[PDB]
Amino acid sequence: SDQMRIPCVIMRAGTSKGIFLKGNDLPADQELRDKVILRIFGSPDVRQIDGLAGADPLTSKLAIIGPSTHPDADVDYTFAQVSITDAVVDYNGNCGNISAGVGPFAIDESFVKAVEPMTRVCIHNTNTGKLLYAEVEVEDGKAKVSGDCKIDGVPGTNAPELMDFSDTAGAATGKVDTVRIGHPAGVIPVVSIVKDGKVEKAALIRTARRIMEGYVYVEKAKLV
Template identity: 65%
Template sequence: MHPEMEQIRCAIVRGGTSKGIFLRANDLPADPARRDAVILAVFGSPDIRQIDGLGGADVLTSKLAIIGPSSKADCDVDYTFGQVSFEKAFIDYKGNCGNISSAVGGFAIDEGMVRAVEPVTTVRIHLTNSGSVLTAEVPVKDGKARISGDFAIDGCPGTGARVTLDWSGVAGGITGKLLPTGKAKDVFHIDGREYPVSLVDAGNPLVFIHAASLGMKGTESPAEIEGDAALMAVIEKIRGKAAVLCGLTDAPENAALQSPYNPFFAIVSPPADYTAINGKKVRAGDADLVSRLLFMLKMHKAYPITGTVCTGAACRIPGSVAWEALGERGKQARTILIGHPSGVIPVEAEAREAPDEPGGVAVTRLGVYRTARRIMDGYVYVPKASC
């Protein structure tokens, strides 16, 4: 043990198209302020390079998973997600991360927190950020989560064992309602213009807007969107107003500081041809709608799982912005194909008529598939002065 540093068990784990630092709850201070100080030191935040920690200096790799014994009798483990800022000394716990969630079941099995059952172990995960329950079906071999397989996901090279995630129980997990405003569509008035939007909460709350409402085609790359400062300013004004309606901030102008993670912001458009950021050609027939998504004030280079889940739910709400952009095949099929900057992601989305519910529907199935694997584990050293 180094006299000037604390030694903490940790693992770096890829879940889907994201990568996170996994920590055991019992290895962290119980006091929230001290805990967050330790976590910021682990990541090397705040610093845009995170050079003095394990963070990857990217919104998709500056992610935290705290895993512990379940506080719910019907679940196997507690999972707390944190989006760690590399620009401020701030960890946003106001949401879920579906990609990182896909690695939680395998991690719990490998750590001996859940008994391995071959060929598939079902892990019930308590999402402490929202109080929801996520079910993961994890392939298992020889007592450990399987890694090898033939399932591929756009946005991650290679193939792996397919992990199935059932998000059907997460509707309204953050705001308390599938439709936070009670309506399938609202109109925001900002700077003298009208912006039709839909606010939907499933997995995480999202703001959906037509690309045309922002003067966009909808197939632009993340770099093109981020490079347009005026467009990004309008997006944040719209997102800020939505954050107030979702109860996540007290004023639109404070959303960037108080709730940079949620709500996500999805720019949707009908199916169209485009070239993904990896050079892959995506044809109009490959997808049922196209979306570009922003979170943590940055454009996502692929598509987050909670965003996928929420987009699937929104597409099942007649009259919503996402439903309006959805192609006819997607309205009829069980699985919706979402075109994103790195390719296409499927989501199983089903709903039943529910006249007494806002939007007239109740979501009954939200299923997605991912791959995941542990990359390293050992100890991270944190200067005692940081804690």
């Protein structure tokens, strides 16, 4: 009676931790939808002590997953950066690491039919409108977790997943092979192709796994 349950899963998506929710498990009204996300995350609060998020920007992001609204997509995906300090749910942009969780989650939730060795998943990003391509290793109707692929920022080794960003060209503007990078915590290669105005492939190897599934509670009285 004091609280309400919401189904909810938590993922490591690449170098991030995401909280994953199904479109229908959230309020239709945007005002209430935002209050409820803030309550799940434990925002606004520097410690995020009364909610699921872990007080770092890398561990305070949302993926809402729903039925595809695009004839060429298996699944719709809405990303949000949930502010730690402010009452703000920011829907501006795509998260490349978080989109690495989407495919495996879509398979494990039967939004996409599992095909052994490898399932191609096509993701419709809402914030952008653009399509992403995930190539997912599948074993027994579920996403493979184990294997020998190292990405920097995550201890140990996991099943590789290829993300294709090639149709991201246009992001905000509407206008536009393995190359290294010495980012904050190591190194990272990508399969770029530079040809003026068309992007052939922008593909990189990510990694993901499900950490938890269950129900978050959210206090009713705090939705005054």
